[PDB]
Design a protein around this nucleic acid. Structure first.
Lengths: 850, 393, 391
DNA sequence: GGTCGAGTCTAGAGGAGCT
DNA sequence: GGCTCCTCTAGACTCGACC
């Protein structure tokens, strides 16, 4: 038990020995806020047999780890920087990889890469071009050459880009890696992918606001587009893409007929990527000198998500639930439109409070006895033909009517627009074009806002007509009686509806905006309060919209994820022998197309995986992360960093005020239970802001030179967020070091903003948990050490827990119940609840060492 | 007006006012469906057959008699079949006695056949039969629509659409949940208000897991379909423990398949869809409505018009569309009455052929859903009717 | 033999002792398997379409299997007795000798009985279906259902039309149905001379006719037409006559009842005997139309083609046999002989060439020729062939 | 060679999604 | 304090269809 003068618990002697006058001022500020005294109980002492730290101090240790981890890849990158090769070579229509001289697979260890994909085939790669020293390389898919009737709709390593200590570079290497055959295998082939887009975002990254203005600092930065980056780093003649856009808008035949041009439009992009990288590599090695940054980036570039046959089941179930739940909402709206067409008869539509202002005009269809007894046998044929011929004769009157078929003249004008044309291939019976977003739906549903019918103004948006084709003011009064005196949003009299005052509906962004659809979830609280009471469903429509809102936006992403199912022959022997294996299923992986950088804060971004899409009980498809299930024999060891950015800000505040942990009120409250802002502003307003740990410089678009006191918020946010990215770099480097030195069979799985997940065998799982705890402890120690603090508190030394779970989810106790997954993962898939282990439990199970 | 009274008038229901009570319609002791209600059920039984036997894999039809062999179990309540001649022969041809007559009554409960109560025991007797058919490839099932007799005493008859699913014990909890989801979608497919169909878990006297579908009838929910995880005992009872004939191929090994019984109520199903679909219109689903087209004639000449309609009638009938020949009616009916008559009968389209049809060929075509009249040429009438019905499926 | 052949191919069902001429005609056992039901399901549809859909003023009837019951003798319908009531007498209070005699009398005086014909089911629905035609004559009532005839108890599925016609032209209408029924049965027959009509008379002297089928053991009455007159209709409706009289073209006339009755359980045996290593069932009667299989590898690729092809045919109303799902393999000839005796109309094979240009092999049951046809043109050909055979 | 009632494309505005 | 994507709607140009 060790305590600081402020009674803050610190590391034990056993850990401190291996790893490693201002008190009065600190107490005065502490007592002023009211945090003086009030001690806390000491946590149990933790002792470990940590491996001998290289180079003495922690900083030298991590530097040596990075320099031993990323050493071959630095040389691989340097190979391109001094490479020589002939210029852009004729295009080859053959199959496989072709070597363009001055082999089944490219042999060299350095490859600038780019892939072109035809969207008609969806996801299978179409062609790719590779730049390598002494020889260009070109790739052509077997679907582009052979032109067969049909192909395999499920992907596999067979129909992928093949290959075989090697660095692969590109503009969106993610795309390059996601199409490489060998990157989906559970066995980790030692290839690392380095991104020019990530290095651009690190060197001269433009913020969210800056790119909006860019599309001063403008001469030193550019957008992530390849043309912009080439103009920035290299310049010269601009890049041009083919205006036909065959890969995106053209069919496969057009790509067949213009192959010799697409092979040039891709070679140009590959050469531009090489030219950019030539200037990016030394510039990035200058801006970020600490090798841990590059090592952590290379570790973030190898994210690997395993899946199984449940992924197709997940997609099918989610899509079908979305359709059925949408069909229930759609079919409920259609019946409301059909029930309103009857108001035409008798001119009763003029009395409808909602459908008065519609097109009810009608077109015209203009052109250019006793029992006889049983019919006899001859009468059977005679009667048949005379009736049959009396119709075939009328078949000749086809030319007496206009060529273009007049569309539903009998149906009213508003109903014609809701009904697709008879010649439409997507024609469905009834008003098949109805939706909640349409302006007729709030009128079809007879919506009321606090007892007033709704109405749409072309300028003010949706509003309600307070009483006070001609609008049926009498009907408006009648409804209010069934359900000046109102003072809601300001009554706009410019609308000038006779006998009514048009009060606009309230909006979430204030009265300066207009309401576009009263079915917005913002009004859901108003629906339950009895204000926005629907007429002829109702809240169920809002509930369905809320449940399917995620899938509506994200199904074209989730369903389109490039899943490659491994064959049985390609699976490791462990999976082919675990008791949970089943021959009738198929197992695969998803390579998240994660860009290592992507923000000024150097955070990794991905629209699908790196978003906190945790399972929800009221959301279709929200079990997306729960579908990342380790194959039999493997488990997902992971941990969540407890208040990562919060503790970084606290320790930055602590290292400045009195130079010890807890000296600040914010740090005191963080460690247990404005100096931080001053230090952040000092770092941001310096000549060149740098990360307080790894010394990573800020982007050239935010240096105070180009921006004279501009974008202060972006810089101050960048300080903390880039410190968090440095923390992630340290964690990944230390984890890889511990995995490789102690021979643990595992690999990095994925790292969302604040999580670190590892795919490891159940055999070596507690070893991985101990490795993770040690990496956390060492990272915290280094973070404290680099700030001028000679000690680390016990309370943040180790994780709260390290999860060991069969699938990816926020907590091991969550069954991930969703409308599309109501039985959960335990029932439908048999995934058991995972284990959460504290430091002491891991020590007990691992006997204090590995 | 009440729905039962409306369906009685339009021949969806049949029976006396005493037989049309809520309880009497539930019991099934009486043919409750008229000429149209039989066609509505015949559509519903065909929709169940397509979804459960045609589109689903490893599902087959099965022929099961209405008579089960006599079981001596005292707990049984199934009605027994007794020969009327046998009763007369013993009772009348000799002097009866208290000692001798009991021998005849005891033999009745011991050997006489009984009316079946469920289609399960018929499927189990055919279980071995399908094992040759599917070459033991688990899982599989047998499905049947037939009359099941349950005591009320009175013998109530209800048409049950059963599916007996034979799956290994590992996937029994999965297929029980799979069919429960597959069933609830089929029932909700045709419903105007899918929220009325619900499911609630239940346990039987042996503690086996179960799930019962309901339809929220106006008086209350009724279990139109119950699913059970029966297990091996039903197979172990019908077959005398010889495992060779019970085990099927559940992958590489052989396992006795767990029996799952899904038992929809077709007779109660049509009753739900009549309540579900209910101006006075039976908004029955186009795949369920009995009458889809309603031909007619105009002012005159009626002889020339009837030649067109008769040729039109054969055009639709040969194309699988049910037609109501309203041109043969012997009493003139006004349009306002003829339209409400077709609406209550759930007629999709009211075709009308007039004298103008003889020159240009344009016929009026009204819609039940919209009540709007649109003209169309005769040559294109069949194309629209097939298209509307195909898109409704 | 056909009896054994239909057993192997699951047209027949039951123990070897139950697959006998006396047992098959008895109806005391389920004599149809999974395939036999579908073939018998086709006869039910073909009978229904040609006798209800295409016929003028014919309507559907559904009736109970049980009947109210009567104490009159000479009827042998098996009664229904509650076992609980039987156990109540024996176990509760030991009733005297007189009570036991009364109990057996009560089992005949009030207990219900199983139906023997569908005629009485239609007659109770004559009044309501008279309202359907606005009391116009003639019209009919048709139904397919199971009837019970003593032997044990036998079950027979009868297809019965009760035609209500005026007293005038009743003989002509009987000849009308006699010709149509003989033509309907001969429509699907490969040997139409096996279906015969013979004049027969009722015990009450009423005129009638019978339709036979020359089974290998002898001609059996698969269909029987009786000119019942109004005695049967007046029996169910005694007293007032206004509710029974139909509105003829000149006066209210009680309709003479024509009872067109036919057996589809016995009819299916006829078309099983008529078709017979290939059962040449009529294209409208064969239970399996298409046989889908995979020729070789890739199994994963071909099975997707078949599953896509299968889903198309099933949506078009064509019954298919998904043979590709089997893990066992046999020679192509063994598949051909297997499918012919299963009465499969067409055999489709999805090979590697299907993945290259879409051409598949289409074998015809009747001609034994294999036609090479594109995948997209398969469904068009199948619908065309079935439509032409129906007409 | 003339009017004119459907296609079609672009431009604009609002809700949901992330910080 | 910011965008970005999906959906609905209004307006102007084009077309071919009929006369």
């Amino acid at each position: 038990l060790r305590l600081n003068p402020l009674l803050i618990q610190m590391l034990s002697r056993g850990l401190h020995e291996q790893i490693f006058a201002a008190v009065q001022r600190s107490v005065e500020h502490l007592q002023k806020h009211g945090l003086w005294g009030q001690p806390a109980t000491p946590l149990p002492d933790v002792e470990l047999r940590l491996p001998r730290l290289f180079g003495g101090n922690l900083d030298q240790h991590f530097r040596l780890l990075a320099q031993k981890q990323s050493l071959p890849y630095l040389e691989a990158a340097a190979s391109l920087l001094e490479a020589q090769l002939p210029p852009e070579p004729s295009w080859a229509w053959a199959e496989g990889w072709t070597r363009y001289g001055p082999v089944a697979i490219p042999e060299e260890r350095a490859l600038v890469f780019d892939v072109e994909v035809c969207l008609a085939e969806g996801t299978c790669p179409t062609l790719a071009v590779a730049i390598s020293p002494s020889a260009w390389y070109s790739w052509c898919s077997r679907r582009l050459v052979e032109e067969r009737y049909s192909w395999t709709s499920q992907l596999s390593p067979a129909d992928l880009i093949p290959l075989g200590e090697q660095l692969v570079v590109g503009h969106n290497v993610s795309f390059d890696r996601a199409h490489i055959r060998e990157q989906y295998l559970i066995q980790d082939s030692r290839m690392r992918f380095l991104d020019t887009m990530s290095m651009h975002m690190a060197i001269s990254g433009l913020s969210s606001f800056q790119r909006s203005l860019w599309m001063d600092w403008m001469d030193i930065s550019s957008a992530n587009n390849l043309a912009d980056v080439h103009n920035l780093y290299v310049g010269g003649p601009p890049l041009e893409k083919e205006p036909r856009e065959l890969f995106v808008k053209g069919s496969m035949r057009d790509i067949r007929e213009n192959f010799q041009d697409l092979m040039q439009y891709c070679a140009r992009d590959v050469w531009a990527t090489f030219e950019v990288f030539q200037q990016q590599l030394p510039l990035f090695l200058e801006r970020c000198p600490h090798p841990v940054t590059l090592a952590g980036m290379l570790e973030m570039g190898v994210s690997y998500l395993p899946v199984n046959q449940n992924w197709e089941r997940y997609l099918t179930e989610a899509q079908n639930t979305y359709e059925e739940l949408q069909r229930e909402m759609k079919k409920s709206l259609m019946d409301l439109a059909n029930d309103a067409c009857q108001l035409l008869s008798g001119e009763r539509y003029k009395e409808d409070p909602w459908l008065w202002d519609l097109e009810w005009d009608l077109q015209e269809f203009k052109q250019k006895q006793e029992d006889p007894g049983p019919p006899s046998e001859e009468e059977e044929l005679q009667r048949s033909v005379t009736a049959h011929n009396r119709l075939q004769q009328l078949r000749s009157t086809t030319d007496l009517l206009p060529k273009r078929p007049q569309h539903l003249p009998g149906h009213p004008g508003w109903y014609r627009k809701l009904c697709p044309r008879l010649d439409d291939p997507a024609w469905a019976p009834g008003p098949s074009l109805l939706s909640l977003q349409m302006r007729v739906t709030p009128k079809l549903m007879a919506l009321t806002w606090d007892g007033f019918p709704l109405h749409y103004s072309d300028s003010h948006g949706w509003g309600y007509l307070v009483p006070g084709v001609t609008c049926p003011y009498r009907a408006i009064e009648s409804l209010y009686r069934k359900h000046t005196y109102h003072h809601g949003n300001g009554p706009y009299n410019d609308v000038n509806i006779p006998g009514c005052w048009f009060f606009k509906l309230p909006h979430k962004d204030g009265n300066n905006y207009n309401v576009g659809s009263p079915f917005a979830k913002d009004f859901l609280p108003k629906m339950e309060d009895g204000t926005l009471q629907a007429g002829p469903s109702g809240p169920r429509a809002l509930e369905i919209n809320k449940m399917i809102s995620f899938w509506r936006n994200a199904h074209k992403r989730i369903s389109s994820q490039m899943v490659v199912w491994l064959p049985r022959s390609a699976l490791p022997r462990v999976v082919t022998r675990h008791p949970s294996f089943d021959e009738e299923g198929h197992y695969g992986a998803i390579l998240p197309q994660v860009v290592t950088a992507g923000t000024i804060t150097r955070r990794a971004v991905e629209p699908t995986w790196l978003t906190a899409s945790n399972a929800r009980p009221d959301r279709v498809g929200s079990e997306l992360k729960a579908m990342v299930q380790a194959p039999p024999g493997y488990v997902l060891v992971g941990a969540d960093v407890d208040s990562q950015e919060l503790w970084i800000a606290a320790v930055l505040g602590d290292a400045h005020f009195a130079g010890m942990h807890g000296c600040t009120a914010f740090g005191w409250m963080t460690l247990q239970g404005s100096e931080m802002f001053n230090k952040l502003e000092s770092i941001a307003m310096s000549d060149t802001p740098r990360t307080p740990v790894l010394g990573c410089c800020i982007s050239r678009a935010l240096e105070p030179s180009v921006v004279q006191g501009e974008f202060i918020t972006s810089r101050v946010n960048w300080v903390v967020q880039s410190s968090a990215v440095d923390y992630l770099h340290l964690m990944l480097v230390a984890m890889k070091w511990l995995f490789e030195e102690f021979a643990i069979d595992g690999r990095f799985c994925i790292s969302i903003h604040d999580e670190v997940r590892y795919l490891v065998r159940e055999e070596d799982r507690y070893r991985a948990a101990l490795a993770l705890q040690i990496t956390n402890l060492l990272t915290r120690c280094m973070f404290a050490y680099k700030l001028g603090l000679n000690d680390l508190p016990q309370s943040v030394a180790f994780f709260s827990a390290v999860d060991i779970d069969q699938c990816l989810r926020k907590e091991v106790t969550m069954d991930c119940k969703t409308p599309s997954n109501p039985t959960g993962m335990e029932r439908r898939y048999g995934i058991p609840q995972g284990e959460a282990l504290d430091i002491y439990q891991i020590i007990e199970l691992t006997k204090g060492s590995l | 007006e009440a729905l039962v009274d409306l369906c009685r008038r339009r021949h969806f229901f049949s029976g006396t006012p005493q037989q049309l009570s809520t309880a009497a319609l539930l019991s099934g002791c009486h043919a409750r469906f008229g000429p149209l209600g039989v066609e509505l059920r015949k559509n519903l039984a065909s929709q169940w057959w397509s979804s459960m036997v045609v589109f689903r894999e490893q599902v087959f039809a099965v022929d099961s008699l209405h008579q089960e062999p006599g079981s001596s179990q005292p707990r049984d309540s199934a009605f027994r079949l007794v020969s009327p001649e046998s009763i007369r022969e013993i009772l009348q041809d000799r002097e009866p006695s208290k000692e001798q007559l009991v021998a005849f009554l005891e033999n009745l409960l011991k050997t006489s056949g009984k009316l079946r109560a469920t289609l399960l025991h018929g499927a189990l007797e055919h279980y071995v039969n399908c094992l040759d058919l599917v070459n033991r490839k688990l899982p599989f099932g047998l499905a049947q629509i037939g009359v099941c007799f349950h005591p009320v005493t009175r013998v109530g008859e209800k048409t049950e659409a059963s599916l007996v699913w034979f799956t290994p014990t590992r996937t029994s909890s999965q297929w029980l949940d799979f069919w429960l989801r597959h069933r609830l979608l089929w029932w909700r497919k045709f419903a105007m208000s899918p929220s009325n169909f619900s499911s609630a878990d239940c346990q039987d006297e042996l503690g086996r897991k179960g799930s019962k579908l309901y339809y929220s009838f106006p008086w209350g929910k009724e279990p139109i379909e119950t699913l059970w995880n029966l297990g091996d005992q039903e197979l172990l009872h019908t077959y005398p423990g010889n495992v060779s004939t019970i085990q099927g191929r559940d992958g590489r090994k052989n396992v006795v398949p767990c029996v799952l019984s899904v038992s929809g109520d077709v007779d109660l199903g049509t009753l739900a869809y009549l309540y579900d679909s209910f101006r006075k219109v039976l908004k029955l689903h186009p795949c369920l409505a009995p009458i889809k087209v309603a031909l007619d004639v105009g002012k005159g000449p009626t002889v020339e018009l009837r030649q067109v309609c008769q040729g039109l009638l054969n055009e639709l009938l040969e194309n699988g569309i049910s037609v109501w020949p309203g041109y043969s009616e012997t009493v003139h009916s006004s349009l306002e009455q003829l339209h409400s008559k077709y609406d209550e009968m759930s007629v999709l389209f009211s075709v009308l052929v007039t004298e103008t049809t003889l020159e240009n060929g344009l016929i009026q075509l009204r819609s039940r859903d919209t009540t709007m009249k649109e003209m169309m040429h005769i040559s294109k009438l069949r194309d629209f009717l097939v298209k509307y019905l195909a898109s409704a499926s």
